[PDB]
Paper text:
Photosynthetic cryptophytes are eukaryotic algae that utilize membrane-embedded chlorophyll a/c binding proteins (CACs) and lumen-localized phycobiliproteins (PBPs) as their light-harvesting antennae. Here, we solved four structures of cryptophyte PSI-CAC complexes purified from Rhodomonas salina (Rs) cells grown at L- and S-phase. The R. salina cells grown for six and 12 days (corresponding to L-phase and S-phase) were harvested, and utilized to isolate PSI-CAC complexes. We then solved four structures of PSI-CAC complexes purified from cells in both growth phases, containing either 14 or 11 CACs, and termed them as PSI-14CACL-phase and PSI-11CACL-phase for L-phase models, and PSI-14CACS-phase and PSI-11CACS-phase for S-phase models. Comparison of the four structures reveals how cryptophytes adjust their PSI antennae in response to the different growth state.
Consistent with the trimeric organization of CACs, both PSI-11CAC structures lack one CAC trimer, but at distinct positions. PSI-11CACL-phase loses the inner trimer-e/f/g which attaches to PsaO, whereas PSI-11CACS-phase lacks the outer trimer-l/m/n, which links to the inner layer through chain-s. Accordingly, PsaO is untraceable in the PSI-11CACL-phase structure, and chain-s is absent in our PSI-11CACS-phase structure. While PsaQ is also absent in our PSI-11CACS-phase structure, it binds to PSI-11CACL-phase at the same lumenal position as that in PSI-14CACL-phase. While the two L-phase structures contain PsaQ, we did not observe the density corresponding to PsaQ in our two S-phase structures. Moreover, the two CpPSI-ACPI complexes purified from L-phase cells exhibited structures almost identical to our two L-phase PSI-CAC structures, and appeared to contain the lumen-localized PsaQ (Unk1 in CpPSI-ACPI)12. Together, these results suggested that PsaQ is strongly associated with the PSI-CAC complex in L-phase cells, but does not or only loosely bind to the PSI-CAC in S-phase cells. In comparison, the fact that PsaQ is absent from (or loosely bound to) PSI-CAC in S-phase cells is in line with the idea that photosynthesis is less efficient in S-phase cells. When cryptophytes enter the S-phase, changes of physiological conditions inside the chloroplast, such as lumen pH values, may weaken interactions between PsaQ and PsaB/CAC-i, resulting in the detachment of PsaQ and the reorganization of the antennae of both photosystems. Additionally, the PSI-11CAC complexes exhibit different organization of peripheral antennae at particular growth phases. The final overall resolutions of maps of R. salina PSI-14CACL-phase, PSI-11CACL-phase, PSI-14CACS-phase, PSI-11CACS-phase are 2.7 Å, 3.0 Å, 2.9 Å and 3.3 Å, respectively.
Author numbering:
A (entry chain J): 1 to 42
B (entry chain B): 661 to 733
C (entry chain D): 3 to 141
D (entry chain O): 22 to 125
E (entry chain K): 10 to 42, 51 to 86
F (entry chain C): 2 to 81
G (entry chain A): 11 to 189, 192 to 754
H (entry chain L): 2 to 152
The structure:
Amino acid sequence: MDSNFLKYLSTAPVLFTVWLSFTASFIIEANRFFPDMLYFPM
Amino acid sequence: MFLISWRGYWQELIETLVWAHERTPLANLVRWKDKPVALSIVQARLVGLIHFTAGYIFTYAAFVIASTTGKFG
Amino acid sequence: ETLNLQIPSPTFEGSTGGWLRAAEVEEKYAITWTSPKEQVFEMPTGGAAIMRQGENLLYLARKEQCLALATQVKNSFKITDYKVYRIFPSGEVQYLHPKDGVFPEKVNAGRVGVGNVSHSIGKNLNPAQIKFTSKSFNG
Amino acid sequence: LSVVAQSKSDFEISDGTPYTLNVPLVGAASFIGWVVPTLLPSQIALYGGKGLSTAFFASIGTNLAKFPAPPGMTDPFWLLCFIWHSGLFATMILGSIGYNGYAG
Amino acid sequence: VPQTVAWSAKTGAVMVLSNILCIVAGRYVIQVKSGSFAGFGLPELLASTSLGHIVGSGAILGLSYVGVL
Amino acid sequence: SHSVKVYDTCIGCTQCVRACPCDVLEMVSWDGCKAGQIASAPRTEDCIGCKRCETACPTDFLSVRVYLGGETTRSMGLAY
Amino acid sequence: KKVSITVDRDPVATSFEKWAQPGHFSRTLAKGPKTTTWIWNLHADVHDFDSHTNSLEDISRKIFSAHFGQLSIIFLWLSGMYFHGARFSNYSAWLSNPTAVKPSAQVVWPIVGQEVLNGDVGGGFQGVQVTSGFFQIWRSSGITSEVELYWCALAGLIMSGLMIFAGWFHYHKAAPKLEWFQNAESMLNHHLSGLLGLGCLSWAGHQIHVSLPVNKLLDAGVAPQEIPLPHEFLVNRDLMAQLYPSFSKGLVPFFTLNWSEYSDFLTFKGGLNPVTGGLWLSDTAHHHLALAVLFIVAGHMYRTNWGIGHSMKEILEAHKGPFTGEGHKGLYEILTTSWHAQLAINLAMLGSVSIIVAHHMYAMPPYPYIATDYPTQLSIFTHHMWIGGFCVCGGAAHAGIFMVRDYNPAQNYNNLLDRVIRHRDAIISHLNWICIFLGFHSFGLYIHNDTMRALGRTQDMFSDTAIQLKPVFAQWVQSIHTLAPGNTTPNALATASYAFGGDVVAVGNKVAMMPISLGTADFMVHHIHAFTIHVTVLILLKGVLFSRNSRLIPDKANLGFRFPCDGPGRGGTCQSSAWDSVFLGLFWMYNCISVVIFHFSWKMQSDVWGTVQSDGTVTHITGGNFAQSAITINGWLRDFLWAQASQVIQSYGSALSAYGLIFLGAHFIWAFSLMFLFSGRGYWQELIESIVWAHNKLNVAPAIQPRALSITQGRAVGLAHYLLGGIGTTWAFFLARIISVG
Amino acid sequence: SQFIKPYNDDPFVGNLATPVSTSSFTKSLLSNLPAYRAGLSPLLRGVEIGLTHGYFLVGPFYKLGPLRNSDVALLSGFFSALGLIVILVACLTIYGVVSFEETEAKDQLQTAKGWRQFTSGWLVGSVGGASFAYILISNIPFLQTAGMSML
Ligand code: CLA
Ligand code: CLA
Ligand code: CLA
Ligand code: CLA
Ligand code: CLA
Ligand code: CLA
Ligand SMILES: CC1=CCCC(C)(C)[C@H]1/C=C/C(C)=C/C=C/C(C)=C/C=C/C=C(C)/C=C/C=C(C)/C=C/C1=C(C)CCCC1(C)C
Ligand SMILES: CC1=C(C/C=C(\C)CCC[C@H](C)CCC[C@H](C)CCCC(C)C)C(=O)c2ccccc2C1=O
Ligand SMILES: CC1=C(C/C=C(\C)CCC[C@H](C)CCC[C@H](C)CCCC(C)C)C(=O)c2ccccc2C1=O
Ligand code: SF4
């Protein structure tokens, strides 16, 4: 893959948008399979 | 108005008002002893702060007194 | 040296941006300059005027207006022949700029330094030290 | 009639420029020029079978008979007069432009 | 509804008149271009006949409106 | 008037003098720096307080310092 | 043939290299960041092409391809609106019962309980109710099925692909030269004739062959799947002559000028269709045909390649009189060499047109069943008032950018610009006096009324039951418009709009339109409107006229269009740039448009919208309280804001709870903006110093040194969050209120 | 032809010579107004201006004041107009004290003696014009209404 296109994908806004979309996305998935966790179950 | 808009806009308006007074007949017979200028930067901050604070006090005083009076409870 | 009051003014159609009663009762500024051409420039107080070939003369209310026009003529028409005067309602004419024939950004002999402080800015005196004292904070 | 089409009083539209306002000629010609086409009749309730100029003149007459009372909101007087005056002002403006400027 | 008429030679007469009127007017008033044999070309003819169909259509419809037909 | 001071850290770059819109500043001779010249403020009665001189100054802390003071017609920038 | 196509082939190489080099487009930013200001400066100046390049040719090429990029985004947006209507909507159920089903084309996923937003909109469907009026557009178009909505979505995607291809091609492969862009006569001829004229003519053809038969069958009562497909009207001329018998004669009446044959489908009815509460589509077809004719005629005015036509330069230079010097001389050169001058004009006109759209679409409801869909009427009026106000303020922003940058006094001697600049004090002082006179005698009437009602003196108020300020001129104009059918518009059958007077049009027992009477409250709020518009004009005009120089700063043009100040001297020159008058005029635009949309909402609920019970009596949403309560500020506070905020604040736990949350969130953002507006940069830089110290202590300081935002950026951030919060608060308030009650 | 020119031949003064500013008709009105008319003492200038202003002052107070619907409306309208005139005379007096230093000349408005004469004239004229308006309104029923007596 082009090294300049990869250098574009390494720019701060792209990484920030991708990383926070991935982060938001596994919060969403964790609340889909394990919803309403008001407490650590113990 | 004093907190958002700052001096340069107002000084340029006031210069157009100084021109209009000097050019209007029957009105340029009357002259200011003090040249009209826009408020200073710090003064405008103080005036906006006073207006903000006075409005804050008067609004809440009217509310806390009237709502408690009207309810009695 | 003195302002020749008879120098022809650059052609101009008038504007409301000119000087007001304070010029005729407190002070007025005048600027003269030589133009090699009959060319259009921008007035500091408004629209466009045409400077006449030969000697031009203007009247403005503020010194900054005369110098803003001077900066303009030098930058665009390369006219470095500009002399700025102050005129009082008594008729007294006061030459202003360049004050000794040489521009201020060029050094000149016989200029005495005013306002020069022998130490750096961090070496000034604290306000408490000079409270209720006439001593100046610049050391 | 500040100045008519003649060199009577030294009139000056501005500080130093004399200018002959042709108030007789322009006012008369604009009045007639607007009125003759305006006579064109129309079997519309606003006109009533007359032209705009004739209906406007008739409306002045009918409301002048009831002299203190003003014409009502639905009275045709207000529509007829506004259109007639708007056309008269426009033909006066255009007439003043044509005569004063083109001079012929 | 304003009254229009089926095409007759009268309609044609109005159209022909208007087209010729505009051809002569275009020889007079077109500022950028043998009264009709100097500098007369296809864009001038096509413009004067386009205005002829506009003036002619308006005249036909108006004369139908008022009763002249 | 406003009070304008020049401290002996001036490198004699003349930038303050060129940036001043009211011809307050000028260059005088001085052996302290390499350029052989220092800025001077002989005409502070004309200072309007714009602080364009301070903006122009490149020494770490400003060699030229404007201290806004009493207001006059000249220092208020009033054409009326 | 001096109008010709000229193109540079392969100008710019399609490379990813400059993608990897943020800031490549300017000499300042291309050397990399050293403070955080660089990051902000990168975004602030990026589409300012004439700040990066000197040549008008490269600027023009960048603009043409960016306009293709915008078109690609708009086509993608339209395609998504059609796809969500096709796939996630109750459109098919709404076609059967337009008066019972509420349009809904947005469905949420069930994640954190957010599926409560899928309310019961009707038609066996759950989703978010939509208010953009797309369903009524589609019914007016004659869509009648989700399959045709899928084909519209695909047509939008194909157009989106073609526009992004055209932008790439015309910047990187075949870029036109500057002499191509500087063809104003050709561009106007094609955009009047080709774009607008053939746009109207082609749409008129669709209305006649598809919209009219399909909507006649729908309004007759035929079920949508029982209606013939739109091409069977195109082919079976007998089936079309059943609905419209004039089609039996074909196109012979068109060509022979026997146009009164076509009165079946080209009508001049006026008024509204009683079944749908919308404009007669035969009228819209005739309207678009007539507009098409005179747009094609207008696009033949200007001279291109054959000697016929006008030169726009000659027209402009010939209009000069004795008051105005050289006249319009030099305006052609301005408008064919400055993009900012063109954008200033086109933005002011586009904003004005959007404001006209807002008034005309509520008063003469064009689509079937949009008049009684009250959430749509309020949404599209409010939306197009906000688009209009923003675009008008950008027209003054780009008039200032022109004056600061593209204006040259040498080429503008003694013409109209020179003369405006040379009496700008007389203009600004007279406008200033008008704004004072008009605030005193409009808002001061409200304060007089607050005081009199509070003091027990109701006989001393400006009201209908007291001292009356009647709008006689507006009432007279309404009278004329009701008298026009058969009188001054003799062949019209009904009035242009029932707002002027006349009948009550009811559809599904809800009022479509009915006369909007004007009283003392209407006199007062119309002068409020004139006051806020005059003040906004004052701020924006003062910024344009004093953009280059003042009595305060004689060389303002050397500082630029956007500078924060020129120091604390001369008493203080904070906010002296032309940018700062756009900044201050967007607040007053917000004030003006907020009062307009509040006036519309309260007046329509109080005096127009509602239900028609037996005997023809109408019960309005708020029961006619505008007349006696819109005359005081306490009336607006109590009977409009307080009374009607009940739905947003009680919305929690329902499908409208999203509006309750956005109401609160926008209150938050609005308040948060005041942190940036009332504050100064120096405080925040000194606070950042201590924060930087704590980072140095832990050896974690960044190499891009943090800075407080610039003075201008603090102002821009404050204004953006102010408008976002205030408009958002009204958006949530308007939508939850009218969805619950209308 | 050009209708706008520099003011009094001076291109750099802050004014323009426009038809509103400097036409023959405008010059005739300004020159003949009492403030600028030649041959008038400062006192007579004050009297003529005072009569005009006092006369129109009575009407708005009378028709729109708090006691407008009462039968004492004209008396209230006169007293309120007189009260305003008394305040305005004080405004004229304080202006004269600060603005002008004492000198022998008394023939011009912009002199301490002249301004005092203008104030004396304006006071008498305003009282006289307000009194005249009072007499006329008291006696003539057309003026008491807006002309509504005819309908
Ligand atoms: C253009 C306007 C528009 C808007 C505002 C929406 C809005 C929506 N759509 Mg619709 N849609 C549109 C157009 C639009 N659509 C078009 C044109 C189509 C046809 C293809 C569709 C087809 C469609 C379907 C089929 C569905 C939606 C759905 C949705 C909803 C959820 C979308 C979601 O969360 O996925 C998020 C999906 C992701 C993969 C997350 C991606 C996030 C990344 C990180 C964004 C990053 C952008 C990137 C960084 C840009 C830079 C590029 C890079 C090189 C630097 C939402 C209401 C869903 C719905 O309503 O379900 C009920 C649904 O199922 N849409
Ligand atoms: C008939 C000729 C014609 C037409 C239709 C247009 C149309 C347009 N031009 Mg113009 N243009 C023309 C001639 C024409 N131009 C000429 C001759 C010149 C040289 C002087 C220019 C120079 C020019 C510039 C410099 C710019 C435009 C822009 C635009 C767009 C304006 C934004 C808009 O409303 O688009 C939305 C409206 C639409 C209808 C979208 C339609 C998209 C296509 C391209 C329209 C035409 C399709 C096709 C002809 C129809 C086929 C019908 C078939 C199914 C039977 C629009 C696409 C601006 C723009 O956005 O550039 C992209 C712009 O900046 N044009
Ligand atoms: C155009 C709309 C509008 C606007 C701009 C205002 C503006 C104002 N109102 Mg008014 N008001 C309005 C409409 C409006 N009002 C309407 C329609 C009503 C109903 C009739 C009221 C009823 C009303 C009352 C009853 C009160 C105000 C107050 C205020 C003032 C707030 C001052 C301030 O800085 O907030 C500062 C804001 C706060 C201190 C708290 C904000 C209110 C929140 C919702 C409650 C508190 C939450 C909690 C304690 C804190 C959470 C902490 C956080 C960590 C999450 C200000 C004068 C109040 C006032 O004078 O303040 C002293 C006051 O008492 N207004
Ligand atoms: C409304 C009546 C009317 C109209 C339309 C015209 C129109 C014209 N006159 Mg005439 N004129 C009029 C009244 C009018 N005049 C009267 C009353 C007088 C006598 C005092 C004259 C005396 C006069 C002279 C002496 C001359 C003209 C000339 C001209 C021509 C160009 C100069 C001009 O005025 O530009 C006006 C330009 C236009 C009208 C075309 C521009 C198109 C726009 C849309 C203008 C529309 C303005 C307005 C809305 C139209 C109102 C119509 C109606 C409702 C009142 C133009 C054909 C000159 C000329 O060319 O000689 C033949 C010339 O020498 N006129
Ligand atoms: C940010 C910009 C923006 C956004 C998001 C919207 C969003 C919307 N608009 Mg609005 N609009 C805007 C700007 C915007 N508008 C501006 C600037 C104008 C003024 C020209 C309008 C005028 C407008 C009209 C007239 C209509 C909408 C409608 C709509 C809705 C349906 C969208 C659609 O399919 O259009 C569909 C649009 C149509 C089917 C008809 C459009 C007909 C106009 C006359 C086309 C003109 C195009 C032409 C090239 C523009 C020339 C401008 C002129 C000054 C030269 C939606 C709420 C429609 C609506 O309310 O539906 C309920 C609607 O009828 N808009
Ligand atoms: C056709 C419309 C149009 C066009 C092409 C332009 C084009 C331009 N404008 Mg103009 N402008 C417009 C409309 C337009 N503007 C309008 C409507 C306004 C009124 C607000 C202005 C006001 C304006 C000012 C005041 C200035 C410009 C400037 C500029 C230039 C720089 C653009 C740039 O780099 O910004 C980059 C773009 C951004 C940084 C985008 C961020 C903007 C906002 C805050 C984000 C949007 C918020 C979003 C919609 C909602 C978020 C949802 C939320 C809940 C999260 C460029 C030539 C600037 C300049 O210097 O020109 C020489 C300048 O100073 N314009
Ligand atoms: C009309 C018109 C048309 C065209 C446009 C326009 C020009 C703008 C407009 C003009 C409008 C305007 C602005 C018209 C303005 C008109 C005005 C204000 C006229 C004032 C008249 C004053 C009078 C008669 C005073 C009389 C006092 C007297 C007699 C003294 C009485 C007393 C004295 C001392 C002596 C003893 C007895 C008493 C009683 C005590
Ligand atoms: C409106 C406004 C003005 C114009 C305001 C002016 C000129 C104030 C003039 C006050 C008028 C003349 C009277 C109001 C005085 C008070 C109502 C009462 C004064 C008497 C008591 C205080 C004793 C500025 O000069 C200004 C300057 C810098 C930043 C913002 C602004 C600003 O917002
Ligand atoms: C808070 C504040 C700051 C400091 C504000 C800063 C440093 C902004 C903080 C941004 C941080 C670094 C990132 C957080 C951004 C948000 C999470 C979302 C931003 C969305 C856009 C930036 C994309 C100023 O610099 C300032 C200057 C002039 C007047 C008023 C103020 C002012 O009020
Ligand atoms: S700028 Fe600072 S350093 Fe350069 S000359 Fe003026 S004072 Fe000396």
